[PDB]
Amino acid sequence: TPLYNLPTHRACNMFLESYKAAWILTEDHSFEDRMIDDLSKAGEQEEEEEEVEEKKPDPLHQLVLHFSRTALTEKSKLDEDYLYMAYADIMAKSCHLEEGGEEVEVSFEEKEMEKQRLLYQQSRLHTRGAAEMVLQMISACKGETGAMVSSTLKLGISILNGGNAEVQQKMLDYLKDKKEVGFFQSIQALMQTCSVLDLNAFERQNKAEGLGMVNEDGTVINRQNGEKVMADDEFTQDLFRFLQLLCEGHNNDFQNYLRTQTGNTTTINIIICTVDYLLRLQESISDFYWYYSGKDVIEEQGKRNFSKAMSVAKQVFNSLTEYIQGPCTGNQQSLAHSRLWDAVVGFLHVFAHMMMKLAQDSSQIELLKELLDLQKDMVVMLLSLLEGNVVNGMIARQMVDMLVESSSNVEMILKFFDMFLKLKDIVGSEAFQDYVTDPRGLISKKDFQKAMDSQKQFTGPEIQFLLSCSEADENEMINFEEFANRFQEPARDIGFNVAVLLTNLSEHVPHDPRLRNFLEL
């Protein structure tokens, strides 16, 4: 259908839509900082030496107490108040402009100057009732999830991005003075509303895309919606980021306050809910792996779903390391008595099987390094669990029991690390039978494969996975030297931390014959 011949009003409407699409790629911006700056600087105009009180509040503080009064009004349902979200985004951008701004790009002096810029931006906002107003906004909503609570969580992340221990002190002081219930109930209710990946929903995700066309090409409503296997991907990450930022710096009060509350009449454990969410995520990943076990190839949508799933898992693990950071004997005993072992056995199982199955495809190496990075954060968390460990102990005994229960995956990963490390030495060996020195090297990869298969000593099988990793068009380069032995910086980094873990578990919990086999392997 040609553009000519069409009535005019439909063309004008399409022009309005296209010009709206082209309208705002980037906005004026800074306008938020300009507004905050103009309201902040002249609090007080011509005083004429008239001070009825100690200090009359500037209009920024007036708006802060207006929002606090609006949140403190007792109701049954929370209204929209889109202007509140607009001001929240304005102040969040004003506070986080320096955070978004942040070889060697900057020097020490400029880095310190930008740190002072961020500190001044945070002090412009938090020397008011901002923390009280965001706590009141969180406590206002019981379990309802929306854009307003997401904006509030983003603002809370923006305030304590660099830790902001003074804001933490004010937070604890107000929580202990008010001693009210509802904040932890709202946090738990928002935690239960989080969803995971679904297999029946994934088969429904198989169906619709297969329709040849909907409306014009893909249906416009479906194409923009893209629908999802994770209804709210950002909200869970923002919630765990805010919880991490509350405990970012070593402040024991919060590591114990989250476990139990003395002033409040009801105790809600965030750590147990986090363990249950991690169990649900582990079950979802195991189900997705079992469904994808039959197929030998993974689509790009599956790659994206895995990337977001392990991003969420990495965020949860970073929150866990932040809690177990500190000496914190109570949370260490709680994780000793929790159901974390059933989660981590399945995690080790899916790590071993996904690394074994995922290694053959060369184009999926990015997902493999993401999985390896997640394993890193896991072994960092495991190392952080061993802080303050007795020689005999009971945490070390539970770790030994975990290794015994997950023996097969541990032996598999140790055997793999043995085989790829052993291969780097054999290639440096005479290897007279390959007989080639070349930029390609190119032991004809197909020709090399009969030659590679012959090893006088050690392993015949390992070379074949390597051949697949090498790019081989016309067998132009086995290039065993080029793309130097695959992912060395990535896998070598996940080897030192499983080594020091074995050294820690070997020096402690002595006289255990079951760990001797693991040490020998």
């Binding site: 060996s429 005479e430 007279f432 006088k456 000593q457 050690f458």
Partner: protein, 49 residues
């Protein structure tokens, strides 16, 4: 080190030392990492088969 290379190829290497099977022990120890033929040739041992 340079002067000891002449006695390695001689068949009469063990004369005063009690162990007469040092060449076989070295061949069995380094037969897998290094080539059996090269280590055998370097220590004399003609017609190893």
């Amino acid at each position: 080190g340079q002067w000891d290379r002449l006695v390695l190829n001689t068949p009469s290497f063990p004369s005063n030392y009690w162990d007469k099977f040092v060449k076989r022990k070295v061949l069995d120890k380094h037969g897998d990492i290094f080539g059996r033929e090269r280590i055998a040739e370097l220590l004399g041992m003609d017609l190893a088969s």
